[PDB]
Design a protein around this ligand. Sequence first.
Ligand SMILES: Nc1ncnc2c1ncn2[C@@H]1O[C@H](COP(=O)(O)OP(=O)(O)O)[C@@H](O)[C@H]1O
Ligand SMILES: [Zn+2]
Ligand SMILES: [Zn+2]
Ligand SMILES: [Zn+2]
Lengths: 641, 539, 312
Amino acid sequence: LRIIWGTNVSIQECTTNFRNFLMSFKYKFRKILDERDEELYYIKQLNEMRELGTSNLNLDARNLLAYKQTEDLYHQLLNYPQEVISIMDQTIKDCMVSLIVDNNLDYDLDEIETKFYKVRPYNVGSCKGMRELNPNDIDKLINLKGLVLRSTPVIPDMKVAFFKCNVCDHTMAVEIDRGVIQEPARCERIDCNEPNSMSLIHNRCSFADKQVIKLQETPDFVPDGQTPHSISLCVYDELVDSCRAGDRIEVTGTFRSIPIRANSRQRVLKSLYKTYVDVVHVKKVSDKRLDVDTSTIEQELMQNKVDHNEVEEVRQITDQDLAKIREVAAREDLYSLLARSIAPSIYELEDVKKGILLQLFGGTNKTFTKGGRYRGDINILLCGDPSTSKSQILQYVHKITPRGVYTSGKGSSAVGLTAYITRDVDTKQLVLESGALVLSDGGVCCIDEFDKMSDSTRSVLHEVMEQQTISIAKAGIITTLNARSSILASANPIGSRYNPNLPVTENIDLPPPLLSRFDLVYLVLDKVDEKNDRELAKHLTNLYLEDKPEHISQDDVLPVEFLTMYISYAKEHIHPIITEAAKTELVRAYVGMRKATTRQLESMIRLAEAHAKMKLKNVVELEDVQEAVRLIRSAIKDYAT
Amino acid sequence: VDDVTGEKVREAFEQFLEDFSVQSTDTGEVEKVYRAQIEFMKIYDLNTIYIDYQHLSMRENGALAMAISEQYYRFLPFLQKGLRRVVRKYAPERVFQISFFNLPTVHRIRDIRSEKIGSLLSISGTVTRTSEVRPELYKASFTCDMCRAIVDNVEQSFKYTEPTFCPNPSCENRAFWTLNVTRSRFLDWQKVRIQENANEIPTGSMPRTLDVILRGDSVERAKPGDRCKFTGVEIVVPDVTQLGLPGVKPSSTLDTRGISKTRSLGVRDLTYKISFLACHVISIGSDEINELKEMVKDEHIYDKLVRSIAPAVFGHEAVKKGILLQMLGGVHKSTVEGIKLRGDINICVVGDPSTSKSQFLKYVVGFAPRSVYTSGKASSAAGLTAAVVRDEEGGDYTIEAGALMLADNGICCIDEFDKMDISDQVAIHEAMEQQTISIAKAGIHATLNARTSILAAANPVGGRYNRKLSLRGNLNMTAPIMSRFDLFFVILDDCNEKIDTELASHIVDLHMKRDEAIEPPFSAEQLRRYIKYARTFKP
Amino acid sequence: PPNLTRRYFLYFKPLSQNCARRYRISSKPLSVRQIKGDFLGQLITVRGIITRVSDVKPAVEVIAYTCDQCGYEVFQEVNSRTFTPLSECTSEECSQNQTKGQLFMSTRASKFSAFQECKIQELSQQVPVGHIPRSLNIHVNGTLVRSLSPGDIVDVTGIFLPAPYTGFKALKAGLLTETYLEAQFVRQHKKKFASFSLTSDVEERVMELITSGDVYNRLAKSIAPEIYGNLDVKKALLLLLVGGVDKRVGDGMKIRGDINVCLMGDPGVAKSQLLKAICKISPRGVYTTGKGSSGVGLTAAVMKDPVTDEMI
Ligand SMILES: Nc1ncnc2c1ncn2[C@@H]1O[C@H](COP(=O)(O)OP(=O)(O)O)[C@@H](O)[C@H]1O
Ligand SMILES: [Zn+2]
Ligand SMILES: [Zn+2]
Ligand SMILES: [Zn+2]
């Protein structure tokens, strides 16, 4: 019997059990968990990983929950994550060498023995924010889900406590013991005996890498009277430059505790221990929404490649799903099926939904040698009678988009939009905080009640809507940053109940140019009549008829997952270059519609590029101009007046 | 371990320096000139030698440098000792400096980790402040507290507190010491603040910054508000600002095991930041005579210049001419009383939105030697002008590099002119009435000098500019600031299909990646030198 | 000590005077001002309203110090706000040992218990004439930390105990003490919606309520009978209270089962009796004026917490 004091964990028994489970796991969860070809789920990763020289590996929890001989390992890695993982770091190499026994290989053995190994349990049991963590359940594997606010600099830590003897031309070496250094005051008595003659040098020693990340907690349930909170944590080396502001995150780690000094003067501490979290893994993507622009993050991609840390940054594809995508693109009913699928719970609003999907496509991202940049984003505005699904659509877009923020009415100011300067509550130093305009850098920006919002705030957007670059000049901060976010907002009519017989360009309580520069606008007038109302009424009542709208899937509605993966692949893989035929229709359509400024030309070209991106065309074609102009005219409803 | 390796490295490096000489024969085989380099250095007694990485790394297959770079400090004393030995060998009151420039690799501030400690590493960034020259403690004498015995040694980098050995060891307490000021050596010092560069920033990101320090004669090569390419070693310094943070904190303590019967523990807390040092820095960011001679001979080159300053923009020749003449300043020395003029000039434009006013801004800021793009609204006078520090970090204050304070002999392009506050327009009026500024806070007074030529963008009250009314009723800004302006421009559109078709043609053609539609007479490369030559012609 | 062997906290609750009357008191509902000074530590029951309570956090009660060489533990006990760590080896084996190998602490063996503070503010009707009320502080630990939420009627119970503070070192005469109270049990006349479990009698109450019939209009009638008529408006208020039904789309959206009402009309007729009765009866209620502190009083605020550095 071998055991750890105050513990029920065995080293060799756990090693044997781990090896047995590793050798025996073939989609056991597809059989036990549910009803859902392949073989040896786990073993492929370990077979492939050897030749690429990587000291990392991921790991699930459902697999241990499924396999017969890992249920007890479940609670033991739960309660004692660090100890169980230190065991696994040896068990993995044991299995590696016991699996090479059945193979003859070129002499690569110089590396594996000197190597190290580590794991990353990522998909684990759910946790209910931090309110659940009363002190009974400290120091345990945990999970969470929140966004990023603030990032700190690098904290070095004493890892090799070098030491310089003052005489006898001798150095000295000593290492850390549970996070402290005990300088040997002596001077190597044999050669010289000076009980307290030694020095310290920093350049010699080795240092660790640590960061601290301020995070905003976003739970799924909250009590009666809850409010947002902030937490601090700590990541360590090989994970630097991974998470930052503007990313939603599902994370894993270990809740912990620590006291703090009462001053920089003596050792007297607080009866209350400041809490924190130490990271184990970070999940940077999820299934219910697409991912970041790939061309926007090339530098970080290459940096991570060089650093040999390859946590997920973009979703991966399958050839069978690629073929399925090409098959689905063959049929011609895409152009309406996408609209029917974006929001099955709402009446048609066909052009509105079509424009939303084209915006999600985005469009073109070109650049010049040094003096140009043209990003894929077309500002959108809504307007019309209230009591419709405008707010519902906006909230849906905010949910489904990964990188965006919601702003409402006059509750906002220029200071709280662009960069603003504040102070930390612990370090008591001048630290900054990112603004909502920049937080959505690439994605969606949602506004509602665009009319009552203050003029001071309404001033800033003039340059955002053009060059996507905010500028800042205040205390100790002079830099121009990037705000590639997109704009998608609603507007309210002048007065109330609208005015049919009046020019709508003057019936909004909003100046001409601010409305004209919008790439496209949509109108939600009422036009009450049957054949458009009874159908809507049933459409919405059948939603409630069921406990949850799953019968809504009828009438040719796609699932979210394949739709999103198709969108992501199309966004990341194709680049339609402008063509020649579209010119003679685009120019004429623009000139004829002028009878109201040149910005609609940019709107039309950027939307036709998104249309070409749809259908997976690598080239524009004349037809997109036709759809763009026709939809613009229908959106403004030219026929009425 | 390097008690053996270091001297071998010294010998190998001095042999490297000696075996090479000045061959450079007919621009052929390049032999390293370090001998004559140190000779020419001894000509003026400067002792600030330079070294190039490529030549050093050529010989010995570069494994030498491979190990030296990561273990730089462990051998640096021996490197300087070998340099001294070579000086003794081949040349006839001695403090030296060294540097390594033209490194192959570049690391941003985010590309620095804890495995580059004491290792040479090239960085590039930006400057936002400087500091005060304060002579630093190179060597310093001490004396015994019971006699005149002087010790002319020094503990230099850190641990600058106490020597031990006394020439006459008969002393009740030889542990502590006295000090002295004159029998000592000193060398210059300077501090700056380094900053991120815009063209390499991530999303949701602030310009993460840190502090770097200089030494020796290489000082005076720093500059506020400029991009620079530093090179040095990963020095680190203590700090306590990192308190109150999670995790366990390392702490030092002398041992009390093995020897016994001898806060009593003398526990010292350790927690360090990662600053940087610089051995050398450079400012980042001929047949030209024949080129410019050929250019000048033409007559319509005026029109060529006018039309070449904004190919990315269409028409509006007035804006082109105004921007071309803005960079040129007028002679401000034309007085006899000593009361002076605002030699340079000012510009401003008007026009409804859906116009290309901002294109001119972005062009000029992306081409100007000195310039800055700011908000115009989201900015305080403290941001435009300089808000200074009040006796922080022990030393004295220092004048911050003001944003508007910048643009010395340059431009300060500012957008969104309508929404400016009251105080900021008051400050701009003060800065414009004279070519001087005055500041004060916490009792301190300041006096600056600058000749700024402002180009800004107007925004009428309602956006619509009533053609039948006067300028004042629509401009909405007080008479003094409205005045002092040499030029006013108006840019409003009208229905003209023949030209609008071609305008849309250009706009859509711009959506052809790096097309040839912007074919100018010539490029910024030679335009900048033309501007530099023309800035001082004195008509 | 025996403290670390304790697997059970304790939290008293005082008697209800209804039974103290049976056979024949000590603690009645009191005020933030009627302490009288002499009540330091006695059994008390104070009412009021909770304004701000910090988030729960751990606090040590017993230290776990293990010896590197002796391999034996040590129990350092702390009951004040601060202490000083035990570094040098005073171990029992080290006592009979020249060497004194250093010791350290544990992160799991050492005991812990939560610590959370709350503030009461006096109820309105019991304030004397033209008198501005004042505040008070309490301390909480362990289990009952979750039974407090701001804005509710409360009857706190415990004991009023002192603490080491003497003004701030200039306006002092010695022996001065800042004070606090102990939290041991919470009862509130307002039962939130989350406390609903049926029993052997409340179902009987519902049964006898529904037996009478005409329940809907009877509710509409019993809604604030101090005013006259407008059964339609009282019914509309009843349906506002009900709220509706919650439905989830499941496609990344839900919809509110919520109601919004207005009572536009000229003055003279009753207008505010409705709102006052609604705030009186409904839980989680709120009342506001029209103008005044509407700039940020209806919006999020920024503040540093007293008992711990944080931007709550
Ligand atoms: N139907 C009614 N029965 C009894 N009293 C009434 C009635 N209507 C109004 N009142 C009295 O008239 C006053 C009117 O005030 P109220 O309607 O509450 O606010 P407001 O002054 O804004 O209308 C109340 O104080 C109330 O006592
Ligand atoms: Zn020695
Ligand atoms: Zn002496
Ligand atoms: Zn001991």
